[PDB]
């Protein structure tokens, strides 16, 4: 928590959260020295609150941004070409309400019979992953 700068990552309640808030108290009537750390879940965009002491550490989750060529819409999992050239169908389109979902499909369609391919972005945290951007 001594290195917990804002804009870095932490696992709060099991949801990868980007630190967007942190307060530190020297000591006081409140009790011994405490610290409130706060972060927004990447998947649900929800900020969460935790309170902890000093001389401790919090789980950090390996998340890597990942672009793959959109090859086909397999009825919600999509054929995706990795940079290595292997094919992954594990990734599914973004859920409903997420306007990304329409921006992926509308851009697959603008591109399907044409010579331009769609590049998606699937930020990947361990097993978890979701298309967060697309582009021609």
């Amino acid at each position: 928590v001594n290195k917990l700068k804002k804009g870095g990552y932490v696992l709060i309640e099991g949801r990868p959260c980007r630190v967007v808030d942190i307060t530190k108290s020297k000591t006081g009537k409140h009790g011994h020295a405490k610290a409130g750390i706060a972060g927004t879940d990447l998947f649900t965009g929800r900020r969460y609150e935790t309170h902890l002491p000093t001389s401790h550490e919090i789980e950090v989750p390996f998340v890597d941004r990942s672009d793959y060529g959109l090859i086909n819409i397999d009825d919600g999992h999509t054929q995706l070409l990795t940079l290595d050239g292997t094919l992954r169908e594990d990734v599914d389109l973004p859920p409903e309400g997420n306007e990304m979902r329409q921006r992926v499909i509308d851009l697959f369609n603008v591109c399907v019979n044409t010579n331009d391919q769609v590049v998606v972005t699937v930020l990947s945290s361990n097993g978890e992953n979701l298309i967060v951007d697309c582009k021609k």
Partner: protein, 333 residues
């Protein structure tokens, strides 16, 4: 090289300039120096901004003007201020969403709703207590006994729906949530609580049972058992209120649980940025109500950066000028 005492001389013609008296209150000396410095602290709060959260956005009710602020304003009001004619100068502050959060004692929460239901009579400080009991008149300013009975008819249904909702929809009621729902229910523009419901302003009373609301909760529990109010969730909400803002300011008028709850909450924030205290209490007894701003800096409730101002005066005299020399100018501006 410090400032010179100097009052404003009244006009020979006879048309007094109240605006020029307000400006020269700071240089009169004694408690007038405090009133002028109190106006200055609030002016810093309303006109605060920085380049990166916006507060005072309001609930977007039509026909009302709101101006955005980078400062969060917590107002501590004792029951007296929501029982005196200071209600008109507080409804204005809430209607224009110039105050982000309010903390009030339970009689004050009960008074606004009873005031919107029924009016208050005038009276004297030296009135015989035994006689007033015979006439069933309470004293604070006389609020009649009949007035609480009209209030009872209103509050009992909202709690019954709250009990029904708690069992059926898993709604865990707390004191703040009952007040916000109660304010939405009043639907009277007169209410300071209705405006806070419309403009999304949270109201917190830690001892909500101490007051008329608590007696009504007691009678309802015998008729309909199992209502639960959780302080643990309320202390979770209240303590987090100051943490978010770039700066927070406390206008605590009066003293008591309200002075302590707002100051205690600001400890989690490392201290309140700006503060004005208006009360009639002295620090000799060792009490919290009379504790000077210096004692609050002792336990970390006030930021060492702040320049706290206390006006040792009855609020009924100090606040009408305080709205005139700060909030009225900014909203019209």
């Amino acid at each position: 090289t410090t400032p010179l005492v100097k009052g404003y001389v009244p006009d020979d013609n006879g048309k007094f300039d109240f605006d020029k008296m307000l400006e020269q209150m700071k240089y009169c000396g004694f408690q007038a120096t405090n009133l002028g410095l109190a106006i200055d602290q609030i002016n810093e709060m309303l006109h605060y901004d920085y380049e990166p959260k916006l507060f005072g956005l309001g609930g977007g009710v039509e026909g009302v003007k709101y101006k955005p602020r980078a400062c969060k304003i917590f107002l501590g009001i004792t029951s007296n201020l929501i029982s005196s004619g200071m209600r008109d100068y507080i409804r204005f502050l809430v209607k224009h969403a110039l105050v982000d959060v309010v903390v009030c004692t339970a009689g004050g929460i009960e008074e606004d709703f009873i005031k919107c239901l029924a009016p208050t009579h005038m009276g004297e400080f030296f009135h015989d207590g035994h006689d007033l009991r015979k006439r069933g008149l309470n004293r604070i300013l006389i609020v009649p006994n009949k007035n609480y009975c009209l209030f009872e008819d209103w509050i009992m249904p909202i709690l019954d729906k709250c009990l029904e909702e708690q069992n059926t929809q898993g709604t865990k009621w707390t004191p703040s949530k009952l007040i916000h729902r109660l304010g939405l229910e009043i639907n009277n523009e007169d209410s300071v609580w209705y405006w806070a419901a419309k403009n999304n302003i949270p109201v917190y009373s830690p001892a909500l049972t101490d007051g008329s609301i608590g007696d009504m909760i007691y009678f309802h529990s015998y008729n309909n058992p199992g209502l639960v109010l959780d302080l643990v969730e309320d202390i979770r909400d209240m303590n987090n209120e100051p943490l978010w803002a770039t700066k927070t300011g406390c206008i605590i008028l009066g003293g008591g649980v309200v002075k302590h709850h707002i100051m205690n909450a600001n400890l989690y924030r490392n201290g309140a940025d700006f503060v004005v205290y208006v009360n009639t209490a002295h620090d000799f007894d060792g009490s919290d109500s009379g504790a000077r701003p210096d004692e609050a800096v002792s336990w970390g409730a006030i930021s060492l950066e702040a320049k706290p101002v206390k006006v040792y005066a009855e609020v009924t005299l100090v606040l009408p000028l305080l709205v005139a020399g700060s909030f009225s100018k900014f909203l019209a501006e």
